[PDB]
């Protein structure tokens, strides 16, 4: 069999002063 | 078998002073 | 079999003073 | 059994003064 | 069995004054 | 049984005055 | 078996005045 | 077996005065 | 301000032979 | 401020032969 | 300002033969 | 500024023959 | 400023024959 | 300013015959 | 300022016949 | 500054025949 998985995310900001607390959680189980 | 898994993340911030707290978490299990 | 796994993360900041606290955690279990 | 795993991370900072505290943890178990 | 694993990390800083505290931990178990 | 593992890390600092405290730890267990 | 392992680390410093305290530890257990 | 392992560390220093404390530990147990 | 947060999860199984490929990932950003 | 955060995960598997592939990913950003 | 953060993970296995591949990634950025 | 952070992980194995490949990566950035 | 950080990890193995390949990576950046 | 950091890791092996290849890498950057 | 750092590692081996290749790397940069 | 750094490693060896190769690298630069 053939499995094609494509995960893409776009995140842009303009945090001039203090971008605060930001976390990016990426998980992939196969 | 043919497995094609691609993960792409775009995080761009135009900061100027103090990025603060950023946490990138990448968890891949295969 | 054929296994193709690619992870690309783009993190670009422009904070010209005090990056503060930035953490990148990459966990790959195969 | 053709295993192809590639992980590419791009981290660009511009902190002209005090990069502060940054941590990069890469865990590869195979 | 053919295993091809490549880890590429780009870390570009521009801290003209005081890098402060940076930590890079690369853990590879095979 | 062919194993090809390559780890390439690029770390560029521009701390013209006082690099301060930088730590790079590489752990390869084969 | 055929084992090919390459560990390439690039560390560029520009600490013209006082490097302070820098540490690099690479442990390879095969 | 065919063992082709090599570690290359690039330490580019631009320190004009007072290198201070620098720790370079290379532990290769094979 | 007072904030209380507790994440409790229970995962029990009986994988006598081959626990397969599982990945427990949790993320908390505050 | 008063912040109380607790994360508890219970993973109990009565394995016998070959645990297979298990990847635990804990990402906390504060 | 009082911060209380506690993380506890219980991973109990019984696999009496070949654990295979188990990885635990703990990333804490604060 | 009263910061209290505790991380406790329990990993109990019973692999009486060939633990195989197990990796524990702890990344703490404060 | 009062900071209390505790890292406690319990790893109990019973591999009476061949522990194989284990890797513990502890990275702490303060 | 009071900083209290404690790291305690318990690794118990029972490999009566051939411990094989074990690697413990501790990286503390303060 | 008061700095208290304690690193305690317990490594119990029972390799009665041929320890093979074991490596422990402790890197502390202050 | 009040510096109280303590590093202790407890190595329990039960090797009776052929310890083989063991590498203990302790690098603490202050």
UniProtKB/Swiss-Prot annotation, chains A, B, C, D, E, F, G, H, I, J, K, L, M, N, O, P:
Residues annotated as binding Zn(2+) 2: 3-4
Record site feature (Implicated in free radical propagation), residues: 23
Species per Swiss-Prot/TrEMBL record: Homo sapiens (Human)
Binding-site positions, Cu(2+) 2: 3-4
Name of this chain's protein: Amyloid-beta precursor protein
Tissue: Expressed in the brain and in cerebrospinal fluid (at protein level). Expressed in all fetal tissues examined with highest levels in brain, kidney, heart and spleen. Weak expression in liver. In adult brain, highest expression found in the frontal lobe of the cortex and in the anterior perisylvian cortex-opercular gyri. Moderate expression in the cerebellar cortex, the posterior perisylvian cortex-opercular gyri and the temporal associated cortex. Weak expression found in the striate, extra-striate and motor cortices. Expressed in cerebrospinal fluid, and plasma.
Related illness: Alzheimer disease 1: A form of Alzheimer disease, a neurodegenerative disorder characterized by progressive dementia, loss of cognitive abilities, and deposition of fibrillar amyloid proteins as intraneuronal neurofibrillary tangles, extracellular amyloid plaques and vascular amyloid deposits. The major constituents of these plaques are neurotoxic amyloid-beta protein 40 and amyloid-beta protein 42, that are produced by the proteolysis of the transmembrane APP protein.
Full-length numbering of the shown residues: 682 to 711 of 770
Site (Susceptible to oxidation): residue numbering on this chain: 25
Marked site positions, Cleavage: 6-7, 9-10
Source superkingdom: Eukaryota
Subunit structure: Binds, via its C-terminus, to the PID domain of several cytoplasmic proteins, including APBB family members, the APBA family, MAPK8IP1, SHC1 and, NUMB and DAB1. Binding to DAB1 inhibits its serine phosphorylation. Interacts (via NPXY motif) with DAB2 (via PID domain); the interaction is impaired by tyrosine phosphorylation of the NPXY motif. Also interacts with GPCR-like protein BPP, APPBP1, IB1, KNS2 (via its TPR domains), APPBP2 (via BaSS) and DDB1. In vitro, it binds MAPT via the MT-binding domains. Associates with microtubules in the presence of ATP and in a kinesin-dependent manner.
Effect of substituting residue 14 to C: Causes formation of an artifactual disulfide bond with PSEN1
Additional note from the record: Chelation of metal ions, notably copper, iron and zinc, can induce histidine-bridging between amyloid-beta molecules resulting in amyloid-beta-metal aggregates. The affinity for copper is much higher than for other transient metals and is increased under acidic conditions. Extracellular zinc-binding increases binding of heparin to APP and inhibits collagen-binding.
The organism's taxonomic lineage, starting at the top: Eukaryota, Metazoa, Chordata, Craniata, Vertebrata
PTM per Swiss-Prot/TrEMBL: Proteolytically processed under normal cellular conditions. Cleavage either by alpha-secretase, beta-secretase or theta-secretase leads to generation and extracellular release of soluble APP peptides, S-APP-alpha and S-APP-beta, and the retention of corresponding membrane-anchored C-terminal fragments, C80, C83 and C99. Subsequent processing of C80 and C83 by gamma-secretase yields P3 peptides. This is the major secretory pathway and is non-amyloidogenic. Proteolytically cleaved by caspases during neuronal apoptosis.
Localization annotation: Cell membrane; Membrane; Perikaryon; Cell projection, Growth cone
Effect of residue 25 to V: No free radical production. No hippocampal neuron toxicity
